[PDB]
A paper describes a structure:
In higher eukaryotes, a single DOT1 histone H3 lysine 79 (H3K79) methyltransferase processively produces H3K79me2/me3 through histone H2B mono-ubiquitin interaction, while the kinetoplastid Trypanosoma brucei di-methyltransferase DOT1A and tri-methyltransferase DOT1B efficiently methylate the homologous H3K76 without H2B mono-ubiquitination. DOT1 enzymes are highly conserved across metazoans and fungi, but not in the early-branched eukaryotic class of kinetoplastids including Trypanosoma brucei subsp., Trypanosoma cruzi, and Leishmania spp. In kinetoplastids, three DOT1-like methyltransferases have been identified, two of which (T. brucei DOT1A and DOT1B) have demonstrated methyltransferase activity toward H3K76 (corresponding to H3K79 in human and yeast) in vivo and in vitro. Based on structural and biochemical analyses of DOT1A, we identify key residues in the methyltransferase motifs VI and X for efficient ubiquitin-independent H3K76 methylation in kinetoplastids. Substitution of a basic to an acidic residue within motif VI (Gx6K) is essential to stabilize the DOT1A enzyme-substrate complex, while substitution of the motif X sequence VYGE by CAKS renders a rigid active-site loop flexible, implying a distinct mechanism of substrate recognition.
Δ42-DOT1A crystallized in complex with the methyl donor product AdoHcy in two different crystal forms (space groups C2221 and P212121), and their structures were determined at 2.1 and 1.9 Å resolution, respectively. The asymmetric units of the C2221 and P212121 space groups contain one and two DOT1A enzymes referred to as Molecules I to III, respectively. All three molecules are highly similar with a root-mean-square deviation (rmsd) of ~0.3 Å comparing 234 pairs of Cα atoms. Hence, we will describe the structure of Molecule I in the C2221 space group and only discuss significant discrepancies among the three molecules. The β-hairpin structure is tightly associated with the methyltransferase core domain through a hydrogen bond network by extending the antiparallel β-sheet of the methyltransferase core domain.
Residue numbers in the entry: 45 to 93, 110 to 295
C-alpha cells in the first residue's frame, strides 16, 4: 500500500487515511493496530512517574521485518518507549543504549511499571528489555557485538541531533556487522542521493541495500510535516 519506489527521487511514503481505521489510527495500513493504545499507555505511565511516536514505531516494525528471533537495538533510547512498543509488537529481545543516567533510570522504571500492564492486557509474557547506561561508542567499539545474532539484528539510530563525527563513526562500524542486519537512520550513514555515490564509495553499495523513506505526517514529535529516513540492509 506504500507509494513510491524507495529511491532517492521516489522515496517510499504512506499518505494518512482520511478516516481512522477500526482502532482509531490514521497512519497504519492495517485496519487494526495498537498505536492509540500505546499513546495513552505511554502518556499515563510517564505521568505516573525529539522522539518517535507510536505510529512511527508501528510502521517501522513492518518496514524492518522485525521478528521474535531478532534483537532490537535502540541507540539513544531515551525514555525507552520504542523498546516497549517493539517488544510488545514483535516479541524480539530489545536493548536500549542511553548516555544520560537520568534517562536510563526513567526507562528502567517505566519498563517495570509497563510490562505488567502489557502482559495483563495481551495475556502474553513480554520479551526481555535491557537498558545500558553508556555512550554507544564505548559499547560498539567491541567488534564482537551483534556477531552471534547472525544478522537477526535490527538497529534504530535516531541521530538527527547527533554530532556528525558520531554518525561517521557509526557508519564505519556498521560496515562490519553481520549480513542481514537492518539499520534505520535519519542523518544518512551512507549518503547516496547522487548517482556518483556508488563510484565514491563502492564498498557501501557492495555491503548495503539502501532504501529511502518519508516518515508519515505527525509520526515524529518535532515535526507535524514529513521528512526523510533511510533503511540500510547488510547484504
Ligand atoms: N553518544 C550517545 N550514546 C548514547 N546515547 C546518546 C548518545 N548521544 C545522544 N544519545 C541519546 O539519544 C537520544 C536521542 S532522542 C531519541 C529517543 C528514541 N530513540 C526515540 O526514537 O524516540 C537522547 O536521549 C540522547 O540522550
Ligand atoms: Ca564483523
Ligand atoms: Cl562480518
Ligand atoms: Zn496505527
Amino acid at each position: 500500500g506504500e507509494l513510491g519506489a524507495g529511491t532517492p527521487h521516489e522515496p517510499y511514503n504512506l499518505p494518512l487515511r482520511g478516516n481512522p481505521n477500526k482502532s482509531g489510527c490514521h497512519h497504519c495500513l492495517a485496519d487494526q493496530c495498537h498505536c492509540v493504545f500505546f499513546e495513552r499507555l505511554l502518556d499515563a505511565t510517564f505521568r505516573r512517574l525529539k522522539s518517535l511516536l507510536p505510529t512511527f514505531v508501528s510502521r517501522m516494525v513492518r518496514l524492518m521485518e522485525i521478528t521474535s528471533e531478532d534483537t532490537f537495538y535502540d541507540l539513544g533510547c531515551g525514555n525507552g518507549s520504542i523498546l516497549f512498543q517493539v517488544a510488545f509488537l514483535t516479541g524480539a529481545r530489545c536493548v536500549g543504549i542511553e548516555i544520560s543516567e537520568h534517562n536510563a533510570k526513567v526507562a528502567k522504571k517505566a519498563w517495570e511499571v509497563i510490562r505488567p500492564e502489557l502482559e495483563g492486557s495481551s495475556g502474553r509474557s513480554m520479551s526481555e528489555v535491557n537498558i545500558i547506561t553508556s555512550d554507544m561508542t564505548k559499547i560498539l567499539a567491541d567488534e564482537r557485538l551483534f556477531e552471534s545474532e547472525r544478522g537477526k539484528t535490527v538497529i534504530l539510530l535516531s541521530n538527527l541531533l547527533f554530532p556528525k563525527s558520531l554518525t561517521h563513526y557509526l557508519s564505519e562500524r556498521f560496515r562490519r556487522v553481520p549480513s542481514g542486519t537492518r539499520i534505520l537512520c535519519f542523518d544518512d550513514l551512507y549518503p547516496h542521493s547522487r548517482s556518483v555515490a556508488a563510484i565514491r564509495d563502492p564498498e557501501a553499495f557492495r555491503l548495503f541495500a539502501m532504501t529511502d523513506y518519508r516518515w508519515q505526517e505527525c509520526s515524529v514529535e518535532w515535526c507535524t510535516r514529513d521528512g526523510p529516513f533511510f533503511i540500510h540492509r547488510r547484504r
